[PDB]
Structures are given as structure tokens and as C-alpha cells.
PDB file of C-alpha atoms and ligand atoms in Angstrom:
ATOM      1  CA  UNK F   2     -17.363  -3.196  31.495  1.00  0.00           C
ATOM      2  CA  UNK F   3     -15.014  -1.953  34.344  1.00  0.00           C
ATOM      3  CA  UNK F   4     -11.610  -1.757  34.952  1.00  0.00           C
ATOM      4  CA  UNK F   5      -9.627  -4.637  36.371  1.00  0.00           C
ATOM      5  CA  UNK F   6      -9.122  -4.518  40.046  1.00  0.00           C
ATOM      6  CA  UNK F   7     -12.721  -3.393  40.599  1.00  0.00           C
ATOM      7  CA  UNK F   8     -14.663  -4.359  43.170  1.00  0.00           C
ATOM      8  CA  UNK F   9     -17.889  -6.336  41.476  1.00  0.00           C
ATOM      9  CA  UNK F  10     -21.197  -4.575  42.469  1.00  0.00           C
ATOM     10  CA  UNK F  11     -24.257  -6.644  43.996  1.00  0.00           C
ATOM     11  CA  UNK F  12     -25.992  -9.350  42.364  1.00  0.00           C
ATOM     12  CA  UNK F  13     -29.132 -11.374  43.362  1.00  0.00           C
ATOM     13  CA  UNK F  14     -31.643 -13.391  40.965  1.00  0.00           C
ATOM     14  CA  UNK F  15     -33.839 -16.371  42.098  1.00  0.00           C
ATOM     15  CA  UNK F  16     -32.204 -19.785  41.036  1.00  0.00           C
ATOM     16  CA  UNK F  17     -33.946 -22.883  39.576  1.00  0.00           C
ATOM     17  CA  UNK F  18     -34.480 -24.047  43.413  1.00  0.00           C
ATOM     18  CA  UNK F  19     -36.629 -20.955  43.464  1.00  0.00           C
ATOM     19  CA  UNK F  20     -34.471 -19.281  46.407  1.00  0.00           C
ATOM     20  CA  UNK F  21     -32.256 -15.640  46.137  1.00  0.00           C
ATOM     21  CA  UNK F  22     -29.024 -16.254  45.312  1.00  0.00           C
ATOM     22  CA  UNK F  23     -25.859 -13.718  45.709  1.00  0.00           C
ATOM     23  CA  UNK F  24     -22.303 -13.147  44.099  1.00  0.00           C
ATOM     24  CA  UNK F  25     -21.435 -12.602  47.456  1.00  0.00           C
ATOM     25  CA  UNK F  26     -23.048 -16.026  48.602  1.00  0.00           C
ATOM     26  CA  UNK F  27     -19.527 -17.547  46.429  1.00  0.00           C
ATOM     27  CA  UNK F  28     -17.037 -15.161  48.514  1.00  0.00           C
ATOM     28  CA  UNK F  29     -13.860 -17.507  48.923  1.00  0.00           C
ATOM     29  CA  UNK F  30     -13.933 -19.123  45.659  1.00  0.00           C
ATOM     30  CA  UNK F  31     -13.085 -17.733  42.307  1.00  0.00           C
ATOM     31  CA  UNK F  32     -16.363 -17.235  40.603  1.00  0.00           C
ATOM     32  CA  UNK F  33     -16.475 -17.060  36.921  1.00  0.00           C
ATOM     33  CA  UNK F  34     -19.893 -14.684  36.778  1.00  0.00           C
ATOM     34  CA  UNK F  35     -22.030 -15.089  32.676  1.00  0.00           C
ATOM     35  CA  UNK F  36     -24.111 -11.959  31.476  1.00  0.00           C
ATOM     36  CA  UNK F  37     -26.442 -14.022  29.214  1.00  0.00           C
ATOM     37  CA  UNK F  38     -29.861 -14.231  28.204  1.00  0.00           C
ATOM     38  CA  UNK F  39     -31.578 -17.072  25.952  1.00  0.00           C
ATOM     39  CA  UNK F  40     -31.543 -15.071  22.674  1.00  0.00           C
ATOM     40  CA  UNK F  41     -27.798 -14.751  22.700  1.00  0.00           C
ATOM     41  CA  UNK F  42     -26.508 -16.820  20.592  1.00  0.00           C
ATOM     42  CA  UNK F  43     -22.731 -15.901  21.301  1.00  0.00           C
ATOM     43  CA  UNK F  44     -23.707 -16.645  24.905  1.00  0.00           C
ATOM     44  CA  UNK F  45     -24.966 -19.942  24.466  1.00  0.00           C
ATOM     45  CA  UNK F  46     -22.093 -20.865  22.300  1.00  0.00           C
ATOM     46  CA  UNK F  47     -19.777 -20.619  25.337  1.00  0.00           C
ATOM     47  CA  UNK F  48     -21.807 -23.363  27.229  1.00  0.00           C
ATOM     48  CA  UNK F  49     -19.167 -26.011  26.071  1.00  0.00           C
ATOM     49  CA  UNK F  50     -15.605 -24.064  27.056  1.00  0.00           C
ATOM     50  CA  UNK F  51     -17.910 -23.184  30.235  1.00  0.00           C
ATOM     51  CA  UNK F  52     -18.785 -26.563  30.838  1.00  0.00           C
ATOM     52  CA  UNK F  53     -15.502 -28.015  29.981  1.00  0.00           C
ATOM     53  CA  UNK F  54     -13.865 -25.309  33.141  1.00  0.00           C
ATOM     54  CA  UNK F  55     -16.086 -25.636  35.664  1.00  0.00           C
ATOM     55  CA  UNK F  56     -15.852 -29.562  35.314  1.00  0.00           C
ATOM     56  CA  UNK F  57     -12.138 -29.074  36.009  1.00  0.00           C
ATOM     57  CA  UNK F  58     -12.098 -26.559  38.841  1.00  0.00           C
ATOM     58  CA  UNK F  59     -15.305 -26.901  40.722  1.00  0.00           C
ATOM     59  CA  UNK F  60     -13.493 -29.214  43.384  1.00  0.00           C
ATOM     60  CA  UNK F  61     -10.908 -26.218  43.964  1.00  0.00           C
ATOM     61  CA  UNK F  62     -12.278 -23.503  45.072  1.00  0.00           C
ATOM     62  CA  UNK F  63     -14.247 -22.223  41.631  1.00  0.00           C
ATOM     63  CA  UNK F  64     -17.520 -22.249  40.608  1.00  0.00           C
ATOM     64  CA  UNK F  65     -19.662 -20.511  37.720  1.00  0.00           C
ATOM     65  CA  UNK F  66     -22.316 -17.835  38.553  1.00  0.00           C
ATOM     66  CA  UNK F  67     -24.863 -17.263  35.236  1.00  0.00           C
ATOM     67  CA  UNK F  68     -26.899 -14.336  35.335  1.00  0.00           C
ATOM     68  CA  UNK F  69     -29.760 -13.724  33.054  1.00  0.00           C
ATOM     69  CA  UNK F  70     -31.468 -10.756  31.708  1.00  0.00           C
ATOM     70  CA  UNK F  71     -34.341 -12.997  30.142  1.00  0.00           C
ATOM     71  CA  UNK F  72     -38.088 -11.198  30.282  1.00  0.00           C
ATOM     72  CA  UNK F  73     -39.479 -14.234  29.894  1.00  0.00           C
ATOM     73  CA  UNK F  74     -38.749 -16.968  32.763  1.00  0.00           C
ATOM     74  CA  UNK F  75     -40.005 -19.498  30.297  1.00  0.00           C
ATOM     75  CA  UNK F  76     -36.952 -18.839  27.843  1.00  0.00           C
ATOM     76  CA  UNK F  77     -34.379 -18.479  30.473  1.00  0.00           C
ATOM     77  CA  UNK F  78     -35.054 -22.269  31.259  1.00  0.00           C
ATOM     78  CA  UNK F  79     -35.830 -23.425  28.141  1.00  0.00           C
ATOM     79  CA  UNK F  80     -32.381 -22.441  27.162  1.00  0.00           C
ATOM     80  CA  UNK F  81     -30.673 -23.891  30.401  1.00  0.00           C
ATOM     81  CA  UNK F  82     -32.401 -27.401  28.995  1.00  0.00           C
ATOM     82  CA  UNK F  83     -30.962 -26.920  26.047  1.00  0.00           C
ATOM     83  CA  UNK F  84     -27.749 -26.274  26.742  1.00  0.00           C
ATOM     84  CA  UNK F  85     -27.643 -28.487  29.742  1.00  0.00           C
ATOM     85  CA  UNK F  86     -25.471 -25.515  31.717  1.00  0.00           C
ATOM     86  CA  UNK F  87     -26.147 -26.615  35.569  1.00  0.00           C
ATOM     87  CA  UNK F  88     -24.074 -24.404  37.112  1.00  0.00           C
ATOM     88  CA  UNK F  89     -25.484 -21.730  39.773  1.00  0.00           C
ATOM     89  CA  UNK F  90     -28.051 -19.871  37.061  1.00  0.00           C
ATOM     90  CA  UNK F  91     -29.656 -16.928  38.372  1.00  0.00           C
ATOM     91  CA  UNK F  92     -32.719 -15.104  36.932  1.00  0.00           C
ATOM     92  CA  UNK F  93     -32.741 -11.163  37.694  1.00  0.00           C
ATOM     93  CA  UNK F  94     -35.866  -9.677  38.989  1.00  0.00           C
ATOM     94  CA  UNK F  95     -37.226  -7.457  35.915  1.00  0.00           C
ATOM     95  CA  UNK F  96     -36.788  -4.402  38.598  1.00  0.00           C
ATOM     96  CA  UNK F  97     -33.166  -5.139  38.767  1.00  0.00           C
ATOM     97  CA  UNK F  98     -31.925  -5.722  35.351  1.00  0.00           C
ATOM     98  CA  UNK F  99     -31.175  -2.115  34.485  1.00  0.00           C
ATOM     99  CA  UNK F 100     -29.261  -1.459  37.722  1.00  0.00           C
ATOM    100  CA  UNK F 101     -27.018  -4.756  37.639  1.00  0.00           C
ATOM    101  CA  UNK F 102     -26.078  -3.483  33.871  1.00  0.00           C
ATOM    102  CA  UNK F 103     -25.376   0.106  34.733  1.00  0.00           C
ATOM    103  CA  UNK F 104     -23.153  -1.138  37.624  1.00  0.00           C
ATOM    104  CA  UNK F 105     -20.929  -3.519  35.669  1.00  0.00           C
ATOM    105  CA  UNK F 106     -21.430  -0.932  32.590  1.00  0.00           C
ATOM    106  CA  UNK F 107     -22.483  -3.648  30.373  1.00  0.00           C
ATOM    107  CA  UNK F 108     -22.666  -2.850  26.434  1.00  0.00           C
ATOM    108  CA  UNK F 109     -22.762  -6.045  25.220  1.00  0.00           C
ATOM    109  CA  UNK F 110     -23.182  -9.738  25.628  1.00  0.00           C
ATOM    110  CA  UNK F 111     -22.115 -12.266  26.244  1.00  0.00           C
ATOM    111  CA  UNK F 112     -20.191 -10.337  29.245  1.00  0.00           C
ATOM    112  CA  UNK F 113     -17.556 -12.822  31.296  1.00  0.00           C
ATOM    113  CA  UNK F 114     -15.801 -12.146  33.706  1.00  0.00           C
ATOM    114  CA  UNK F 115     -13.171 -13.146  36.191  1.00  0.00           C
ATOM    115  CA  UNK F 116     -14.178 -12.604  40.230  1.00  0.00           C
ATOM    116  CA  UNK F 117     -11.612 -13.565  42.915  1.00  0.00           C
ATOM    117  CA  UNK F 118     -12.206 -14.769  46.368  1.00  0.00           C
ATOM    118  CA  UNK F 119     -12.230 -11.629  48.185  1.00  0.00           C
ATOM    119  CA  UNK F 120     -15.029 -10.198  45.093  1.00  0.00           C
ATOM    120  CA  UNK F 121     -12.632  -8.380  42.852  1.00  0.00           C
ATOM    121  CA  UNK F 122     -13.076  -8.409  39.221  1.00  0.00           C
ATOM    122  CA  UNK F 123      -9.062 -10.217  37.943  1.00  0.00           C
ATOM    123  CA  UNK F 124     -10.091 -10.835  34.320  1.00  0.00           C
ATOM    124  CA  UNK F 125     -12.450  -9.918  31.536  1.00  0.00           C
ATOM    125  CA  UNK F 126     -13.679 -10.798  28.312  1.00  0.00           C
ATOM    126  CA  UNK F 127     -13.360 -14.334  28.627  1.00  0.00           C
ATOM    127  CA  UNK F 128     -14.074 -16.658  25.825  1.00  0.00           C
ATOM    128  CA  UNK F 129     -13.296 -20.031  24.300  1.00  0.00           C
ATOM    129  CA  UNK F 130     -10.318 -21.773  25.252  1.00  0.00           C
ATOM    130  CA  UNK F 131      -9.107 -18.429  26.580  1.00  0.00           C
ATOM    131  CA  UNK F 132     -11.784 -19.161  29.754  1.00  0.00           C
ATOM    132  CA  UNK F 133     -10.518 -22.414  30.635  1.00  0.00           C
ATOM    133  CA  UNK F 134      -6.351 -21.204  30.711  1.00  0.00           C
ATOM    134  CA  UNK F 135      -7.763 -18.132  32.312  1.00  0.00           C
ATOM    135  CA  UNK F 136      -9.272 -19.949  35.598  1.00  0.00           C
ATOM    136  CA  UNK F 137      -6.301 -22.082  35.711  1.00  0.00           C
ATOM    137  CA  UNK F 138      -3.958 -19.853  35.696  1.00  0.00           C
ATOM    138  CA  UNK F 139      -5.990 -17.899  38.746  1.00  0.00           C
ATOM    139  CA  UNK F 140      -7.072 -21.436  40.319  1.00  0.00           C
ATOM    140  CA  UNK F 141      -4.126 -23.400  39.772  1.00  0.00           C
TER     141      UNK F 141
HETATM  142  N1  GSH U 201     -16.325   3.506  39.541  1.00  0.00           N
HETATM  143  C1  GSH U 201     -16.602   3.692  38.091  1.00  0.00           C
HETATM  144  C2  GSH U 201     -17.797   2.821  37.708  1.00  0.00           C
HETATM  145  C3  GSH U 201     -18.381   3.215  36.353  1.00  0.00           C
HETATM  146  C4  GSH U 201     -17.640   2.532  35.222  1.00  0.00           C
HETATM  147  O1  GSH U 201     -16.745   1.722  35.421  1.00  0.00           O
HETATM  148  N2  GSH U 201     -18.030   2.852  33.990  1.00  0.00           N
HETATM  149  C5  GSH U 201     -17.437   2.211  32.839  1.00  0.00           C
HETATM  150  C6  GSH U 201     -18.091   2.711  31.551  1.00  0.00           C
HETATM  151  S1  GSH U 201     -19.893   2.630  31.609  1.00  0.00           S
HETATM  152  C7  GSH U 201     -15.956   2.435  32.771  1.00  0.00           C
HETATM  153  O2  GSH U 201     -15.482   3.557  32.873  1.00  0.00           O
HETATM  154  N3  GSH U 201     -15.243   1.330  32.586  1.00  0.00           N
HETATM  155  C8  GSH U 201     -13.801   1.305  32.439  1.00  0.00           C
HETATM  156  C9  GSH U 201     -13.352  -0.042  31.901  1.00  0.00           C
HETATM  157  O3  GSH U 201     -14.212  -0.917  31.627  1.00  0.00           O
HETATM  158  O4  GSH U 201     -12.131  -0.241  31.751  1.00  0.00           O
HETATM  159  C10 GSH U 201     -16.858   5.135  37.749  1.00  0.00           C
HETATM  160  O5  GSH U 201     -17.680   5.779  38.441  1.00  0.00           O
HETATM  161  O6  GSH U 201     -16.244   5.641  36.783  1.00  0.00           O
HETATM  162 CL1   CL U 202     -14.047  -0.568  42.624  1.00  0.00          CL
HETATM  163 CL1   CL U 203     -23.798  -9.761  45.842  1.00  0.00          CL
HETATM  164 CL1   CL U 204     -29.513 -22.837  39.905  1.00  0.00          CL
HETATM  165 CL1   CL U 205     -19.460  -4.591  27.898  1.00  0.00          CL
HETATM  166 CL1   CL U 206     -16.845  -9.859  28.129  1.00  0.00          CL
END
């Protein structure tokens, strides 16, 4: 990961509209932003506490940003059906994977983190109940 107070690097996958979307497309809300990928079973056990936040903050100025590793598109939906997580979900281009990870120095998954408004990274390692008193604390 990186240090707190960093500036988060560039993201873009293709959503389930089929259109590019951007971390910085979500500049002036808090954006809680999901490393995931459908064989993480960590990951997917989060969809509940994730669920359960951005129900409660999406009106005020907060919203959740998944991005997926998956290879296989097929997967990557498959497992947003499953876990019925309709946030903004973002599948990265297979040519982009290894960059976004180097860039946010990701080891491991699931990887959550904490964006502000202006695109700085305020919290990490976010999970369970922890999430949900995390963005209030930063939204409220
Ligand atoms: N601007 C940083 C970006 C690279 C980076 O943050 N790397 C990770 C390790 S791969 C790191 O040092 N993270 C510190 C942390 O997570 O607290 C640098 O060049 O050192
Ligand atoms: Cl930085
Ligand atoms: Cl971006
Ligand atoms: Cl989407
Ligand atoms: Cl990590
Ligand atoms: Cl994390």
C-alpha cells in the first residue's frame, strides 16, 4: 500500500454500462475505492459492511469505486450477481492491471481504502464494521 496522505494514482476500467470510468470522475466526494477480483473470497466477504456504508452515505457526498483485476470478464460479473454489489464496479483493461498495482503497491487483497474529495488517500485497510465508522467519521 502507500502511506497516508498520498495522492491516489490513476484509475480507469470499463463499467457494466460498458463506458471508461475514472477515480478522478468521483473528485468531490469521498470515494471508498475496492481492490477485488471474483476469486477473493476475503473480498467478497466485505460486500455486506460495503453495502451496509454506501447505503448510509451515498446521499452525502460518498460513493464506492470497485476495481477488479479479474482475467476473465465473465467472472468479474458473475460475482457482482452474486453478491448483488451495485456500486460503480470497474473492470481494468488486462494492459493496465500491473501498472494500477505497482502504483498503489498492492501485495494483497482485498485492498480498501479511504480517498477524500480532493483524491488523497485518508485511510487504509478498511474492513468490517471498521469501514462503516471509518466513512462516518470522514463523511459525517
Ligand atoms: N511515492 C512512493 C510510491 C511507492 C510506494 O509507496 N511504495 C510502497 C511499497 S511498494 C511504500 O513504500 N509504501 C509505504 C506505505 O504503504 O506506508 C515512493 O516512490 O516511494
Ligand atoms: Cl503522493
Ligand atoms: Cl483517475
Ligand atoms: Cl458499474
Ligand atoms: Cl497491500
Ligand atoms: Cl487494505
Amino acid at each position: 500500500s502507500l502511506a497516508t496522505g498520498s495522492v491516489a494514482p490513476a484509475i480507469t476500467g470499463i463499467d457494466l454500462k460498458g463506458n471508461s470510468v475514472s477515480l478522478n470522475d468521483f473528485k468531490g466526494k469521498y470515494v471508498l475505492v475496492d481492490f477485488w477480483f471474483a476469486g477473493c473470497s476475503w473480498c467478497r466477504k466485505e460486500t455486506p459492511y460495503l453495502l451496509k456504508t454506501y447505503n448510509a452515505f451515498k446521499d452525502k457526498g460518498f460513493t464506492i469505486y470497485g476495481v477488479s483485476t479479474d482475467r476473465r470478464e465473465e467472472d468479474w460479473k458473475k460475482a457482482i450477481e452474486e453478491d448483488k454489489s451495485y456500486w460503480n464496479q470497474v473492470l481494468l483493461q488486462k494492459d493496465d492491471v500491473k501498472d494500477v498495482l505497482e502504483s498503489y503497491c498492492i501485495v494483497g487483497f482485498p485492498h480498501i481504502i479511504l480517498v477524500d474529495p480532493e483524491g488523497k488517500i485518508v485511510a487504509k485497510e478498511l474492513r468490517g464494521d471498521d469501514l462503516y465508522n471509518t466513512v462516518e467519521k470522514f463523511v459525517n
